[PDB]
RNA sequence: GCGGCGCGCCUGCUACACCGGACCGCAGGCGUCCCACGGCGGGCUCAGCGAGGACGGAGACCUCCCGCGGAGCAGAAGGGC
RNA sequence: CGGAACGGCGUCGGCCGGUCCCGACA
RNA sequence: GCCUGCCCCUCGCCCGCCCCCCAAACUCCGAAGGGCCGCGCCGCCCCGCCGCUGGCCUGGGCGGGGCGGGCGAAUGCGGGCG
RNA sequence: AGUUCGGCCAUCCUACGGCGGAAACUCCUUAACUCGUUCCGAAUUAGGAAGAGAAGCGCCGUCAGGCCCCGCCAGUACUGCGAUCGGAGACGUCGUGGGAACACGGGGUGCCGAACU
C-alpha cells in the first residue's frame, strides 16, 4: 500500500494555465464575450457594460467600455461615497444599491452634459424625478433626438436571485436616466400578475431594516445592541430610515459632481529578492551542514 | 479490360502553357454577396448631390 | 502561546447514510427514521450502474442521506458517542481530518423499536472545519485552502478528545 | 481518399496547438476590421461553426463585406490554369488581421518623411529603393595571430 | 519452412508493428533478451564487446533466437554463466506479411491470383540500421580471451556482413575506461546496478 | 470475374509538411436513432489518486481531498469541449 | 572474367600493438 | 524459529530509480523543402451625401475640392480580351 | 500600496516553508425579511460589523517540479538540386544549397493599461 503521485512532471508539462482572471475567478469569460461582442459592422462605436460589483463593505457601480486593452472606466461611484451623501450606515443594503445607481447615472449624464454644454443629456433626460417603484424604462418613451445613453448590465459572477442588490442598482441607474435593458420580473413584487410598486417603494426606502430594527428591540434589546451597533450610535432609528433615504436621493440627483478625497500610499516592507550570487551561497552553507556535520 | 485510372502527369504543363490568368477587375470588387444594408446605403447616398445619375 | 481564534475547530456538518438496496419500500421506511432524528427531509441518493451481488439496477434508489449542522449536529453526534460508549477506533480519523463510526439499530439512538418500522442500521461521518474554509466553496474567488489551516487528523483527534472526552 | 467531407484529412491541421486549447482570447472578437484590410486566415477547431474548407487555410485575402457577426474574405485559388476570386464568409474567430504589407505601410511613410526632412536640411535624397543585399567591399581585416586549422583523423568516432 | 530469408531481406516496406490494426502476429521465437549474469555489479564487468551491423537489413526472429542460443553457449562452456552478460539489443518489432495462394481458382469460387494480396502476418522480423549494435557481451577479466570467439561462432547465423568491436567505453556504463575511473576516485558515480550514471548537481538538496 | 462491391457516402491512414494525388490496398463505418438525445437560461463538475466510515468485501453508498479532462457528448474514427 | 555469405604465408600497401645489440635455460 | 502462535522470512504485485530496443492509422519538439499575399502612391486641410449607424457633434462608406510631395527591390519582356 | 473593470495568457503555474496588513480586501457575522438549498443559509440570497492574519491575498525563500531564454547538441541527424562518383546490392560519398530535435549545462520567475482611495 504505497501509491502513484498526481503532480508528475508530465501533468505539469501539460498544464494549460487558465487566463489570469479565470484562475482568480473574478471574471466569467463566457458572459464577457456575449456582453462585449459588438456586431462588426458598427466598428469603433463603443459599447458600455454597467459593472455592479458586490463586496463585503462596499457596492461598486461604474459604467465601462472595453477597448482592445483598457476597459476605460468612464465614470465611477462606490458605496463608500454614500455617507458623504447623508446615509451614515447601511452602505450595502438594497436601498443603498438604488442610491449607488443614481450616484453613477447622474454623474454620467452630467459629465457628458457639461462637455456637450448645449440643449442635451440631463435636461433631455431628467428621468423619474423622485425614487418611486413604478416601472420606468427611460428610452421606452419619447427618446427624441439624442437617445438615452444605454449601457448593458454586468451582474458579474453573482447569481441572479429574485430582487438581489445588483438588480436594485440597475433601477437606480434607470431612475437617473441611463437606459439599462430590464424586465423587472426579477424585481420583488413582480408576481406574474403584476409589478408591485410597493415592494419596490419600501425596499428602495430601506424599510427592510426598519421591520427588523423595531422587532429586535422588543424581543431582545441586548441582541439588537450587538447586531445593529452602528445604526444606534448613528441615531438612525427605524422610523428615521425613510427620511434619510429621501434626503440622500434628493442630494444625489441635484449635485452628483464628485470631489477628490486624498489617499496615503503606505508602503509595506516587501523584503526584496535575495541577490543571485547570495542565492547560490545559501546552498553552499547547507552543503557544509551535511558534509562537516 | 484492365485500364489506367487517374494520374496528373502532364496536367501541370497543359495548365501553365499560358495559364495563371488573373481573375479580372470586374469580379475583383463585385457587389454579389455584400451586406444588403450596405448596398442600400451606398446606392441612396451616391444618388444625392454629386453622383446624381438621377435627373 | 495563543492560537489565532480563527484556528479553532468546528463540526461543519454530519452526513447520515443508509444503504438498503431498494427492496420493495425499504428506502421509504428509512425515510421515516431519518426524518424524526434530523427534523429534515432525507434526500434519496441513487444507484450507479447495475451489479449482480446487490439488487441495484441503474435507477433503484439505494441510499438516503441528510446533512445536519450546528446545534443539531452536536446532539446527534453526542448520541453517537454515548451509544459507542465514548470509544472510537483510532484509525477512523482520516487525511482531511474527517472521522466516522457505525450505528447498529436506528432504535439504539433512542428511537422506539416498531413492528411497523423494522430496525435499519445507519452510519455516520462528521466533517471538521477550521473557520476560514469558505475560500474553497465560494462561487467567486474559489481557491484551495493553505496547508496550515487544513485540519490534520492528529489535530482533529485532539478536538474530538476535548469535545466529547472519548477514548480510542 | 474514398471519402471527401468538408472536414476531410484535417487530423493535425484543424487541431489547436499544445497549450492553446480553450476559448479564444477575447482580443480576437474585439479587434476592428476595415473594408480592404488583408486578413490572414488560420482555421481553428475552437468553434465548430464558420470554419472554411481546409484549402482556404493560409490564403491571405481582403475583406469584401464587414457583415454582422462575420467577415467576407476574397482569396485567390488556383484551379486548372486560372486564379479564381472565391469569396467566403468566416466568423471573426477563425480569421486574424494580416501584417501583409507591413513593410510597405512603414516604407511609404518613412521614405516620404526622409524627403520631408530633405526639403529643409538634407538636400541630397538617400536612394529610396531596397537593394538586394549587394556584393561586399574592401573590409581589410587584421590577420594578427590566426589559429592554424588542420583537418583531423578518423579517431573519436 | 518460413521460406528463405532473402525474400524479406532489406527494409523494403515502411515499419508495420504489432498494433490494434495488426492481428495475429505469429510469435517472436526469441523470448529471452538478457542471458548470463543479468544481476551484475557495474564494477565487476570491466570490458564490453558488441556485434556492429554491417548493412541496413532485416534480421529474422528465428535468427535472433538461433544466434542467442549459440553465442551464449560458447562463453557458458568456457568462461561460465557467471562471467558473461549477453544483451540482444535489436528487438523483433516489424511483422512482415505472407500472401496465401491455396486450393482452386475461378469466378464465384475460392478467390485466387494477386487480387487481394495483403498477406496474413508471419515471421516477426527485426529492423536494423548500419551501425546499430545487435549483440552486447559484458565480461570480467577472465573472459576477455573467449569473448570475441563466442560472437563470431554465431556471426554466420546473423544475416549479411557484421563487425566485432571492443568498447573503449568501460562496460555497459556509458562512461569510458578513463572517465569511469576518474569518477571512481572522485566519488561521482551513483551505482544504479547493471548500469551507472554521474551523481549530478540537480535535484532538491534534501 | 458476379466469390467480394471503393457501383452513392463518411473517419483515420496510404500520401512523399499548401492543395490535388492511384489500387477487389490497409483499420473501420453509413442507409438509422431521438420531441427529447432539441433550443435557451440558470446551477453544477466529470472519470477517477488517495484516506476514512453499520452490514459492506474486486466491487453498491456517503464524505472530504488532490483532481488539464485521464470522463460523456445516440452510433465509424479523428478533431473539439 | 552476370553474382554473394565465406575463405586466399597470391601481390602491393596501411592501421593498432608487443618483442629484441641487459642481441630474438644456455 | 509455532494448538493457530505470524513473535516474518523469500519471490512477486504495486509503487520510486535507472536501462535496452519501437509505431503508418503515436507525437513534447520538428527541419529541408513547399504554399499564400504584398513590394507606390502617400501626408495634410477642408467640404458634401447617407432612408445606415449611436449616447453624442459617433461612425464607416461613398464622392468632391485645394495644398505638400512623387516613380520608391533585381532581371526579362508589350500586355489583355473574345 | 490596495481594490475594481480589463489586455496578453505559466518569466503569470504547482508545491512547501516563512513574512505581512494602516486602509483596501478577505475571513467574519447571523436568518424578521427578498431569496436560496436532489436534504443541508455548505453554497446561495437578505440583513450586519464584535473579532482576525489562521487561511485567501500580497511579498521572500527552496542545488524545489514545470514554464521561459541562451548556449551546447553540431554543421550532427536529416534534406533541396547536380555527378557514366564509389557499390552485386543495401546503400553510401562528392559538388553546390539548407539545417533540426531530444538530452545537457548556464541563467530568468510577470508585465501593461483605465477609474477610485
TrEMBL record, chain B:
GO biological process, one term: cytoplasmic translation
UniProt-annotated binding residues for Mg(2+): 19
GO cellular component, one term: cytosolic large ribosomal subunit
Gene3D superfamilies assigned to the protein according to its UniProt record, in alphabetical order: 6.10.140.1730
Highest taxon in the source lineage: Eukaryota
Disordered: region residues: 1-55
Annotated Basic residues bias: 14-25
GO MF entries: structural constituent of ribosome
Keywords linked to the UniProt accession: Metal-binding, Ribonucleoprotein, Ribosomal protein
Similarity comment: Belongs to the eukaryotic ribosomal protein eL29 family.
Protein name: 60S ribosomal protein L29
Species of origin: Giardia intestinalis (strain ATCC 50803 / WB clone C6) (Giardia lamblia)
From TrEMBL, chain C:
Entry's Gene Ontology cellular component terms: cytosolic large ribosomal subunit
Pfam families from the UniProt entry: Ribosomal_L5 (PF00281), Ribosomal_L5_C (PF00673)
Entry's Gene Ontology BP terms: translation
SUPFAM superfamilies, per database record: RL5-like
UniProtKB keywords: Ribonucleoprotein, Ribosomal protein
Gene Ontology molecular-function annotations: RNA binding; structural constituent of ribosome
Coiled-coil spans in chain: none
PANTHER family the UniProt entry points to: 60S RIBOSOMAL PROTEIN L11-RELATED
UniProt xrefs under NCBIfam families: PRK04219.1
Family: Belongs to the universal ribosomal protein uL5 family.
Name of the protein described by the UniProt record: Ribosomal protein L11
From TrEMBL, chain D:
UniProt keyword Ribonucleoprotein, yes or no: yes
PROSITE patterns with a match to the protein in the record: RIBOSOMAL_L21E (PS01171)
Source organism, top-level taxon: Eukaryota
A UniProt-annotated Pfam family: Ribosomal_L21e
Keywords: Ribonucleoprotein, Ribosomal protein
Record-level Gene Ontology MF annotations: structural constituent of ribosome
GO cellular component term, pick one: cytosolic large ribosomal subunit
Keyword hit for tRNA processing: no
Biological processes per GO annotation: translation
Assigned protein family: Belongs to the eukaryotic ribosomal protein eL21 family.
Stated name of the protein: Ribosomal protein L21
Organism (species): Giardia intestinalis (strain ATCC 50803 / WB clone C6) (Giardia lamblia)
From TrEMBL, chain E:
UniProt-listed GO biological process terms: translation
Domain of life of the native organism: Eukaryota
Cross-referenced Gene3D superfamilies: Ribosomal protein L10e/L16
Signal peptide annotation: none
GO function terms (MF aspect): structural constituent of ribosome
Residue positions binding Mg(2+): 13
GO annotation, cellular component aspect: cytosolic large ribosomal subunit
A Pfam family assignment: Ribosomal_L16
Keywords, comma-separated and alphabetical: Metal-binding, Ribonucleoprotein, Ribosomal protein
Family: Belongs to the universal ribosomal protein uL16 family.
PANTHER family on file: 60S RIBOSOMAL PROTEIN L10
Name this polypeptide is given: Ribosomal protein L10
The organism of origin for this protein: Giardia intestinalis (strain ATCC 50803 / WB clone C6)
